[PDB]
Design a protein around this ligand. Structure first.
Ligand SMILES: *[C@H](O)[C@H](C[C@@H]1CCNC1=O)NC(=O)[C@H](CC(C)(C)C)NC(=O)c1cc2ccccc2[nH]1
Ligand SMILES: *[C@H](O)[C@H](C[C@@H]1CCNC1=O)NC(=O)[C@H](CC(C)(C)C)NC(=O)c1cc2ccccc2[nH]1
Lengths: 306, 306
């Protein structure tokens, strides 16, 4: 028992992280086979970053302008090209530690592990959710661009996120590994705001099931509700609508605990209207929405990865 | 910016994890050089576990009784021996992925990363604190024994924890890597209770500094307090006493923010007496005590590891 915000083991990704330096700028690259992936704004300088033209900037670069450092080994760039907001640097060495991998774009409400890196060297690992407004609440300092987010499915690493920037509210924005930003953001220093966020209802309910599986039952009740009457209560509290598909995904957790999904909704309704009256759920005094139904089943059952 | 509960990159430890099977019992081992370390209760069976005699049980075992599995390679045991509550299995192969390492015993109030493992395969990584009562609030299922806790100092892995058991309150107990339990626990199935816990005051204050560094200032105030008058308030709220040494450790965070340690204490005093009035600090509605001053300086400055 117990429930922790738990990241994937980071070793498979640690072996892909490199340092990319171009001019004054140093950030992180992702080295897979003979390509290093990094954020295209590495080719910028501080006055380039106001409103740059990256196509113009890139034709001006030379292969030898990109210093790619894999630990204490320098990698020879033999080709560069832009793909949306990422750079693909072709190097003269395939990464011998390339895991089996995929580039996947996630949906808001889904989670992933982030390997925060600086100068090509991993600093820490932690779990994040893609918020409804397409930001993530990360932990990122200058130099962390090119850190990646990922999930692991048996032996296969699905890269979903590359870090690019911090918004003025302290939340973070980036791209998938094809270079396409999550959300309405651009890799330019202009007035960009996150946009209003909502709480991920299905994750809150999955986390209530985690808590029941782990002994926390005080918030349960005999009442029930219709999906329609719950969703009226969701709108009022800036919770996202609950669909029949969400109810389905929560079926295994319903079966395991014997608490009908709509019954848990009635519990959520009362927690929303009454608060928690000084009590805690799984050691939190807030309703937690960054655990998926998958995350709960994975942790409360013991799945591993090879 | 941002502040996340952040684990160390787990790759160096993933390469040490193996599967140890003896009779009916399978758990995890830690393979360093030519020794696999695992919890001694692997030699038990279900009726052995009521009140076993491990010395008696071990003389009855044979080297070939221990099946040690490193991924899909079987390791030949050529020697076994007991050290307190751990077994040291000598194998005929040094682990080529042995990082530079140390066995260190931590103090309550200190943190470490846990690599949860099942059948020798890492499942997830997360950050834990050693509680004042010598338990940790982990996430551990049957089969997770032999998972280890660790910190990384540049390139060197300091192993501090081996998992052994869950107490009836759902908290976890284990040993250092020399086999010595943290706290008054034994690797026997008898009536064992955690014992009353306290909140780690110095960590709460370090986390308040993290929050100030990250923009959360609402809880600050012009008042101050003496260390003596704060510690009266600590006892009342089951917080642990604050020493002059704690005040010293918090000096760099004091210097950085310009908030005198004793001033932050005055803020903590009011949060304890008044609560948080529906507000949050770093996205938590509780006072958080599982971040050390070190953890805060590390995350809010960007230290990495090679
Ligand atoms: C890349 O290492 C870096 C990561 C961010 C630094 C601080 N926290 C981070 O996550 N990215 C950048 O520095 C961005 C570069 C551009 C805009 C070219 C993508 N810049 C920002 O993140 C940035 C600049 C700002 C100015 C004013 C307010 C907020 C800002 N964010
Ligand atoms: C080792 O894989 C396992 C890990 C725990 C299983 C459930 N969560 C865990 O962390 N350890 C054990 O199974 C312990 C074996 C002994 C006692 C020999 C060290 N047993 C327990 O943790 C255990 C048995 C209990 C019985 C009744 C209440 C609580 C118990 N904990």
């Amino acid at each position: 028992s117990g429930f922790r915000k738990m990241a994937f083991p980071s070793g498979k990704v640690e072996g892909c992280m490199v340092q990319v330096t171009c001019g004054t700028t140093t950030l992180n690259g992702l080295w897979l086979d003979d390509v290093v992936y990094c954020p295209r704004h590495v080719i910028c300088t501080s006055e380039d970053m106001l409103n740059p033209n990256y196509e113009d900037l890139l034709i001006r670069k030379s292969n030898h302008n990109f210093l790619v450092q894999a630990g204490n080994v320098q990698l020879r760039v033999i080709g560069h090209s832009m793909q949306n907001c990422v750079l693909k640097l072709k190097v003269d060495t395939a990464n011998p530690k390339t895991p089996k991998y995929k580039f996947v774009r996630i949906q808001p409400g889904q989670t992933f592990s982030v390997l925060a890196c600086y100068n090509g060297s991993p600093s820490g690992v932690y779990q994040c959710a893609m918020r409804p407004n397409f930001t993530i609440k990360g932990s990122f300092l200058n130099g962390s661009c090119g850190s990646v987010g990922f999930n692991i499915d048996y032996d296969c690493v699905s890269f979903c996120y590359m870090h690019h920037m911090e918004l003025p509210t302290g939340v973070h924005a980036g791209t998938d590994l094809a270079g396409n930003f999550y959300g309405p953001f651009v890799d330019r220093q202009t007035a960009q705001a996150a946009g209003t966020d909502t709480t991920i209802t299905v994750n809150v309910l999955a986390w209530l099931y985690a808590a029941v599986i782990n002994g926390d039952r005080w918030f349960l009740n005999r009442f029930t509700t219709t999906l329609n009457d719950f969703n009226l209560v969701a709108m009022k509290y800036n919770y996202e609508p609950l669909t029949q598909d969400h109810v389905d995904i929560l079926g295994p957790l319903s079966a395991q605990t014997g608490i009908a999904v709509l019954d848990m909704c009635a519990s959520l309704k009362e927690l929303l209207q009454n608060g928690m009256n000084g009590r805690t759920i799984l050691g939190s005094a807030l309703l937690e929405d960054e655990f998926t139904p998958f995350d709960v089943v994975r942790q409360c059952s013991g799945v591993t990865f090879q």
